[PDB]
Amino acid sequence: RNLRDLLAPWVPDAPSRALREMTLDSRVAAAGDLFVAVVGHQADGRRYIPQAIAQGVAAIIAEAKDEATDGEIREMHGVPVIYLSQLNERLSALAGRFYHEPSDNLRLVGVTGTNGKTTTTQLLAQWSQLLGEISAVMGTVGNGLLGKVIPGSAVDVQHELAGLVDQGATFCAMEVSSHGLVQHRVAALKFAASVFTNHLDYHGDMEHYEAAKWLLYSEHHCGQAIINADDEVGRRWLAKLPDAVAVSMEDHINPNCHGRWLKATEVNYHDSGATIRFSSSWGDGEIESHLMGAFNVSNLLLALATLLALGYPLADLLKTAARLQPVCGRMEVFTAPGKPTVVVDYAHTPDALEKALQAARLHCAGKLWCVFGCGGDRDKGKRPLMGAIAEEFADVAVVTDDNPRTEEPRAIINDILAGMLDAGHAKVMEGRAEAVTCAVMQAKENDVVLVAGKGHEDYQIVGNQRLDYSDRVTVARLLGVIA
């Protein structure tokens, strides 16, 4: 890596100097490094230039704002210092060139929106890998090849993607935060596809918000646009994007305009997942999904439309659909012959618990059971709100412990019960393992038991002890299966 080569597109006069790593932080700036001095949230990296020089950096690129002309080449203690205008905007392109353009050496799919980003990126990564890609994810639960996801500036993004390119990745599904896009953290990435999953009442604010977002997207390499037409903003944007794919399970495909599309024609929500019949511009089909709830049908259809748009054959996608797995502890289904369906979900807030019960109800011909508690030595305000949700959206509420820590366990349970119209209806069982057993052994064959609050977590905090305990293991053992 060479300062001269790195800067050729922007500064033709740049000195030839070997470069090791690229860093924004003067503290880690080692001998041979490139130090990038940017102006951020009241923080001015140019303050740290002499300290970086003193640690033996090979060269510095720095904001020109107030200090120099764009492409002005200076030299301090024999260290080249090159100044660039609007460096925050160009950091992605600069790091891209530094790391040999990693988004041009694999198929990068970006997923944006408030929800379904984790699940949709996981589905894209799993499905593409089943079709023979070596697949990776970058998002909220961390970066890596599938099954090896280790838990962030424009430089970090390009560096991480290059790391995945080096480990052999040929496909990467990336969560793009609303916050990342606006701060230019993905400004130079070549997206093969951009997936849109899903305080704006005054119509000037919707107009500004849209204008701000449309400007950003016009500046990115978005590749194929795949948009949820079940979202009202999704629809407006599809009207303006004649090449975008429309995806719907709520009858919002308008075939007069929308050129390419995919819609769920009917969904049977059953005791072990969802049977999805669909029509698309690529042809028709039926998918056996092992994911639970209406939102996971949407997420799966977005991943499908995206992979069809990129040229993956419909017959190969249909033949692998049944191998798609839940994100561990996210509406994760456990079934066994002649036993109640059991779902483990991490829902530990009033809103998450309501969504997970509504999701669970679709699959439930009999009674819906909710086994849950609330953390001790934490905010107590959600307790009566989670009681009232469980009483309303479930048929049987089984209230138990969930990380009581040092707090009197029955105290927490009382606060939960206080939120209910009829606390006497609720079952209380202390010992979470025993409360899960209660629900699972008493539930009928066509009942569903939702076990809420822990998801993937493999500990119960009682006092200051992290006891070995897993909802998933307890359920799997009661059902006579393997977690």
Q: Residue 39's domain is classified under what CATH number?
A: 3.40.1390.10
Do 425 and 291 share a domain, yes or no?
no
Beta strands in 167-252 (DSSP E): 171-175, 193-196, 224-228, 245-248
| Structure-derived torsion over alpha carbons of residues 332, 336, 339, 341, reported in degrees to the nearest 10 | 20
Q: Are residues 130 and 217 in the same domain?
A: yes
Residues 197 and 63 grouped into a single domain: no
Both structure tokens of 55:
């640690």
Task: Tell me which method was used to determine the 3D structure.
Answer: X-ray
User: Is residue 383 within 8 Å of residue 374, measured between CB atoms?
Assistant: yes
> Among 323, 357, 388, where does a domain finish?
323
Q: Residue-wise over 37-53: b if at least 16 C-beta within 10 A, else e?
A: bbbeeeebbbebbeebb
Kindly state the helix (H) or strand (E) to which residue 53 belongs, with its residue range: helix 49-54
Q: After which residues is the chain discontinuous, taking C to N > 2.5 Å?
A: 151, 198
Residue 64 and residue 105 share a domain: no
The residue among 284, 300, 323 that closes a domain is: 323
Q: Where are the beta strands (DSSP E) in 168-240?
A: 171-175, 193-196, 224-228
Q: What are residue 145's DSSP bridge partners?
A: 136
Any long-range contacts for 178-185 (C-beta under 8 Å, 24+ apart)?
Answer: 178/112, 178/114, 180/152, 181/112, 181/216, 181/220, 182/212, 182/216, 183/88, 183/154, 184/88, 184/89, 184/91, 184/92, 184/154, 185/92, 185/152, 185/153, 185/154, 185/157
Q: Which of 80, 96, 112 is the last residue of a domain?
A: 96
Same domain membership, residue 279 and residue 139: yes
Distance separating alpha carbons of residues 233 and 213, to the nearest angstrom: 11
Q: Domain count of the chain? A: 3
Bridge partners, 81 (sequence order): 60, 74
Q: Are 234 and 228 in contact (CB under 8 A)?
A: yes
Which residues constitute the domain of residue 44?
3-96
Rg of the Cα atoms in the chain: 26
- 403/420 same-domain check: yes
Q: Does 404 lie in the same domain as 301?
A: no
Residue 321 has phi, psi (to 5 degrees) of -55, -35
Is residue 20 within a helix (H) or strand (E), and if so which, with residue range? none
CA distance 462 to 467: 7
Do 459 and 468 touch, CB atoms closer than 8 A? yes
Are 180 and 65 in the same domain? no
CATH of residue 467's domain is: 3.90.190.20
Looking at the structure, do residues 364 and 312 belong to the same domain, yes or no?
no
381 shares its domain with 356: yes
76 and 162 part of one domain: no
CA angle at residue 208 from 203 to 211, to 5 degrees? 125
Same domain, 119 and 232: yes
Residue 185's CATH number: 3.40.1190.10
**Tokens matching residue 125:** 């990564």
Resolution, Å (one decimal)? 1.9
